[PDB]
Amino acid sequence: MLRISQEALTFDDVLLIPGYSEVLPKDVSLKTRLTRGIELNIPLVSAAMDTVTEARLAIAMAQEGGIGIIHKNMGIEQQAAEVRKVKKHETAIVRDPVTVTPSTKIIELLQMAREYGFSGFPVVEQGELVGIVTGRDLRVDTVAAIMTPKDKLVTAREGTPLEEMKAKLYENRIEKMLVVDENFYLRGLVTFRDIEKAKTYPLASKDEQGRLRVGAAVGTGADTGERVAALVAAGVDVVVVDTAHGHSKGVIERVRWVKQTFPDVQVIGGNIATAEAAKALAEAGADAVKVGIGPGSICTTRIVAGVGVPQISAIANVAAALEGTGVPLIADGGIRFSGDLAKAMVAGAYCVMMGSMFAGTEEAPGEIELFQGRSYKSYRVPYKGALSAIVHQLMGGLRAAMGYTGSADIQQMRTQPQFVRITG
Amino acid sequence: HMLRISQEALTFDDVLLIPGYSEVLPKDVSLKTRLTRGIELNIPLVSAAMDTVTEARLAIAMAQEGGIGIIHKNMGIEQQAAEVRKVKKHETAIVRDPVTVTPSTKIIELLQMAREYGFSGFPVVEQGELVGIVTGRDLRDTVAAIMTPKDKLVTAREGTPLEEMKAKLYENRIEKMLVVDENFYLRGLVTFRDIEKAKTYPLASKDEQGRLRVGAAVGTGADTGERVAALVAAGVDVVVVDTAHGHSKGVIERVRWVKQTFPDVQVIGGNIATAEAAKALAEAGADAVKVGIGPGSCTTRIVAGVGVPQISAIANVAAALEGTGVPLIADGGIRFSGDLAKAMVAGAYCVMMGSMFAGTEEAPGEIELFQGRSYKSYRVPYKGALSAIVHQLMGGLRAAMGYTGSADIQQMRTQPQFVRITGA
Amino acid sequence: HMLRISQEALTFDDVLLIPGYSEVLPKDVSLKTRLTRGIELNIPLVSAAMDTVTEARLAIAMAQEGGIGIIHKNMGIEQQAAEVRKVKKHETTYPLASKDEQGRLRVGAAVGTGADTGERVAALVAAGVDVVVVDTAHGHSKGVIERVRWVKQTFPDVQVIGGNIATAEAAKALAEAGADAVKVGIGPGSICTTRIVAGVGVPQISAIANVAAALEGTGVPLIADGGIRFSGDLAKAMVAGAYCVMMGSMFAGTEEAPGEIELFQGRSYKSYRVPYKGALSAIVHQLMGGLRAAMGYTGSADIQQMRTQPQFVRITG
Numbered sequence A: 001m002l003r004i005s006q007e008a009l010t011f012d013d014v015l016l017i018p019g020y021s022e023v024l025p026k027d028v029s030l031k032t033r034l035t036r037g038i039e040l041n042i043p044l045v046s047a048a049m050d051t052v053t054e055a056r057l058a059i060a061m062a063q064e065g066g067i068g069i070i071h072k073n074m075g076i077e078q079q080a081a082e083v084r085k086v087k088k089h090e091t092a093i094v095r096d097p098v099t100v101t102p103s104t105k106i107i108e109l110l111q112m113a114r115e116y117g118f119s120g121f122p123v124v125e126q127g128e129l130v131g132i133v134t135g136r137d138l139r140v141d142t143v144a145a146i147m148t149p150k151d152k153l154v155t156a157r158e159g160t161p162l163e164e165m166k167a168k169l170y171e172n173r174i175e176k177m178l179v180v181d182e183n184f185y186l187r188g189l190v191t192f193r194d195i196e197k198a199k200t201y202p203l204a205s206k207d208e209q210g211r212l213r214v215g216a217a218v219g220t221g222a223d224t225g226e227r228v229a230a231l232v233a234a235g236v237d238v239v240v241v242d243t244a245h246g247h248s249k250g251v252i253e254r255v256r257w258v259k260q261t262f263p264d265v266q267v268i269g270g271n272i273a274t275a276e277a278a279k280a281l282a283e284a285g286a287d288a289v290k291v292g293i294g295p296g297s298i299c300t301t302r303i304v305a306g307v308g309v310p311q312i313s314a315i316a317n318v319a320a321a322l323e324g325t326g327v328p329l330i331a332d333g334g335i336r337f338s339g340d341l342a343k344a345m346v347a348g349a350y351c352v353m354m355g356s357m358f359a360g361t362e363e364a365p366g367e368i369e370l371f372q373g374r375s376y377k378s379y380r381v382p383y384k385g386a387l388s389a390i391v392h393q394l395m396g397g398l399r400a401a402m403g404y405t406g407s408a409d410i411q412q413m414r415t416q417p418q419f420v421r422i423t424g
Numbered sequence B: 001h002m003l004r005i006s007q008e009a010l011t012f013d014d015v016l017l018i019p020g021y022s023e024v025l026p027k028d029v030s031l032k033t034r035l036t037r038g039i040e041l042n043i044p045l046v047s048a049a050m051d052t053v054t055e056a057r058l059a060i061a062m063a064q065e066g067g068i069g070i071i072h073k074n075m076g077i078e079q080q081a082a083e084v085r086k087v088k089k090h091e092t093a094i095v096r097d098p099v100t101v102t103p104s105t106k107i108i109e110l111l112q113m114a115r116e117y118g119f120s121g122f123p124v125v126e127q128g129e130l131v132g133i134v135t136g137r138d139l140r141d142t143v144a145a146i147m148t149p150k151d152k153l154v155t156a157r158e159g160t161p162l163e164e165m166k167a168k169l170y171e172n173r174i175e176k177m178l179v180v181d182e183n184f185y186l187r188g189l190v191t192f193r194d195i196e197k198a199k200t201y202p203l204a205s206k207d208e209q210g211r212l213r214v215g216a217a218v219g220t221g222a223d224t225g226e227r228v229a230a231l232v233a234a235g236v237d238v239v240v241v242d243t244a245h246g247h248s249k250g251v252i253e254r255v256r257w258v259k260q261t262f263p264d265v266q267v268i269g270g271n272i273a274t275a276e277a278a279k280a281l282a283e284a285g286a287d288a289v290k291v292g293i294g295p296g297s298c299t300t301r302i303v304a305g306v307g308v309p310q311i312s313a314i315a316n317v318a319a320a321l322e323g324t325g326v327p328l329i330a331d332g333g334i335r336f337s338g339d340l341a342k343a344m345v346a347g348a349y350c351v352m353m354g355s356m357f358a359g360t361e362e363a364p365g366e367i368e369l370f371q372g373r374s375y376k377s378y379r380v381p382y383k384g385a386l387s388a389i390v391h392q393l394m395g396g397l398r399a400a401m402g403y404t405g406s407a408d409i410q411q412m413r414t415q416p417q418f419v420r421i422t423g424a
Numbered sequence C: 001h002m003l004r005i006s007q008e009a010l011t012f013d014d015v016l017l018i019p020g021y022s023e024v025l026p027k028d029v030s031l032k033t034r035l036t037r038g039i040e041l042n043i044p045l046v047s048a049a050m051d052t053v054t055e056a057r058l059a060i061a062m063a064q065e066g067g068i069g070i071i072h073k074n075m076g077i078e079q080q081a082a083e084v085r086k087v088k089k090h091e092t093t094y095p096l097a098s099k100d101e102q103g104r105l106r107v108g109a110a111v112g113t114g115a116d117t118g119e120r121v122a123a124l125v126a127a128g129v130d131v132v133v134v135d136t137a138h139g140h141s142k143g144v145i146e147r148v149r150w151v152k153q154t155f156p157d158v159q160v161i162g163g164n165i166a167t168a169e170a171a172k173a174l175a176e177a178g179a180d181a182v183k184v185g186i187g188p189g190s191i192c193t194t195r196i197v198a199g200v201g202v203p204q205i206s207a208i209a210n211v212a213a214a215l216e217g218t219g220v221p222l223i224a225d226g227g228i229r230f231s232g233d234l235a236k237a238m239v240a241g242a243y244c245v246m247m248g249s250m251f252a253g254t255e256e257a258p259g260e261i262e263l264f265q266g267r268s269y270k271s272y273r274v275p276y277k278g279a280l281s282a283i284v285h286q287l288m289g290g291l292r293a294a295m296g297y298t299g300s301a302d303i304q305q306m307r308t309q310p311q312f313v314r315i316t317g
């Protein structure tokens, strides 16, 4: 009559068994799904923690091929403004160049040149590009009289490949070129030198319009309705309804409201740890579920409430419940090493959320502080350098595990390899 | 016969500064001092000639902070001289080694060069003399046909202040300017925007030609003459004849040889720890001496049983050099900014730091992540940017000078007093 | 031009009190002393103007035991005046209570030298503060000397304390500025930040003796601030010359000190973490118990005798 549901296993209870392998670790595919509608080139998402994910680290996550969830320990307007920073991050073209209008007085243009130099001011009339003003133009009353007019401009259409533009610069013997839309409205500016140095991120997570992807977290408190609406107006790709107990009337209804009110935004629900919670979130319309309740030993949930589910079994039970639905599941918590990340994938996660592991990187919030001959971030977290090096080690280990199991892609890794149970 | 004990010698922990009447705030005291007969420093900091501490990149940062670095000698002659050159030739905004063409270069070849460097301009040189530029506009046979001629060139003579160049760029309504010398040989290329965005270092240690100062270490082995001559030709400001036992025929003669052979370069000898050694190096021609033999529980003491506690060594050397105009550099034994203050009051003109600068961003080595922490690899903790440590060390010195009522380094060295304390 | 050592300077662990012929029981000696020219105390104990030690509640306890508290200044002007007013208006019977002419419990308050100091002093004086403690890291300075002169001239009916100092010359300079007492202690402890960051300090036994000799015959008391770990050190500070001793951290965590009691891993702490230490009176009782035993050992019937007659031995490691 002691109601024991099952024996539940954690990461240290299992090991992956090697299997026949034909694909080298460097050649396997890591592509996966965050939600019904969002694909990621690596199975990594950064946690909505105020020591982990603000705009800077979310941009870096998306560039690596995963995604960041911006934390909610801030005001509604600030959270939306963080989303905007990610959506607006552009790698090559310059979007807000300093312009003037035909009516601008040359006296005023010369004042702006004390800060900006003489490389050239675009001339705009209500967003229409009508010419450019160069220092050479000032060298041979309003800029309408001296500007180079529209029929001498060399421009590139918005959306032209960055390598087609470099070629047009060369053909025209120019270094700068203005970018316009179909109607000759100014849309930005590219430089030959800036295309050359333009670091590129071929794995970047991008939406259908080419902008970096980003998520944002919300609770179930009173202003959630207004926070979700601001995040959606900002272009957020995914809203994470994120509480300690996702299997609750509060979370289920908030997920339903988001899915009914903002049908075209992805919604994740959690956290959960059972098949039946997974089903309740799927039926409320969740586009993905986040798995993890007291996943680690000695941890407030276990010590204070005696509640928790070992994370291997929690992941496997959720994956079993969702097989066929099309709803991914994100493993949240208990990963301390890359080996644990590989086990979470074989147990059925579609990808993995990391938190404190990313805290203290250069891209995470906080300022670098020198303490007692050591580096910390303060707001005392040790300073960890660039996020790319951590991502590289994690994905390096996952690739290694896919080599040992003969898994050529994530779908195989999630469904084919086997564990052994060990004793310690 | 009896036990030949010369004196009781005090180290840093034996003494404390007595507070005195003060009416100058720490932020307002002057830290200006002298490294040698002929080199002034804005802060009394010198980075040590260690191969985990001082190569070009850290030497540049030390000089910009107002101190100086001694480039280490654990490298070949030509490699050390190249490190000197990188410091002597470092510039904020002026691009050096620009891609050039000649008046005879064929326009076909220039177009091939533009594929990689783009347009915006190739200086035209004729055996190093500047005779024109080729811009994209000039292209819309040979470069001499199309090149903009010498008389259309806006040039500034090298060594002009940056704000001076920035003004000339403004006056002529251009973005690029060429830097020339007395005979119009090309020296570099500077742009308005590179100047507007360059960091200024108002405290920088510079020579009479405006170049960052640097020193370099030599020993007494057989290739020392060749090494010294290569360092002098590279522009080194000071040669440090740097051995474990400065009070020796080999160091004394090598200091003398440097002073007689290279009259125009400053020479430091060391290390020493007695009045007698101080007089011997000053008589040999040294422009400063370096103090420190076995300053605290180290290899010299354990292996050879040799050393002089550093407070007494500094004061003994200081008394021996009083009235000679030869400064002394305290080297070794400084754990804390408080020890640096004590060294100054005992008579040092400045302090050499070693391993405290190891592991900074600018120090040699690469950053690695190990166990959620950051180190420098070549096993040292990553300490962040040099300026943080420098700021801490000088902040403590400033506080000591506030406590002693010292308004400048000269007062700090000659007026304040110590108490001798017990082990208790 | 040799190394400029003014003297060897001794701390508490360098010295011990020598027993002397004795005729008084510890239970019978007198502990009365002065805090300032105009303020007597029945025990020579002062609580520190630290935000972990002295707000109104602990100043109230201190004055009831016969000492006094200095309210800290890490708070607003009106707030700190409110704290002073709480003490002056409080009636709990307590036979040793430190009280002013009106029968109100005595209290002090700290101020600095920054910009708003003039308004802070004015507000504290109007709340009834008994003594203004002009309290900086470096009392031998233009700022402190001029502020104590300003207080003595603008508010001649309050007592003024200046510090901290550690030399004879600084003591005489504060006295000439009008100080009613000086506070002694610059870098008193082995690992002061002062010592580590600036290399500055004076071991406290020598600092106290030097300041006491400089103020002899002036009527200006001196308060030993810092370095007291045990009641034995308190005894030594009195024999070196102090009139009373100021405790800080040792009072932190008492029931009366600021902060909120919290339970962490089966232990109690004050949540601002320091351990919970129970009632202040037990600590004050142990300290005065140790001092009474020292006076019994040395033969001192009262504080004047304890400050002037007994001798130290110097000891080694």
Ligand SMILES: N#CC1=C(N)Oc2[nH]c(=O)[nH]c(=O)c2[C@H]1c1ccc(Cl)cc1
Pocket: A134, A135, A136, B120, B121, B122, B123, B133, B134, B135, B148, B152, B153, B154, B155, B174, B175, B176, B177, B178
């Ligand atoms: N000196 C000069 C210049 C002259 N004469 O022409 C122009 N015409 C412009 O329109 N902008 C310019 O910035 C310049 C500068 C220039 C200097 C060096 C290079 Cl490599 C390229 C250009």
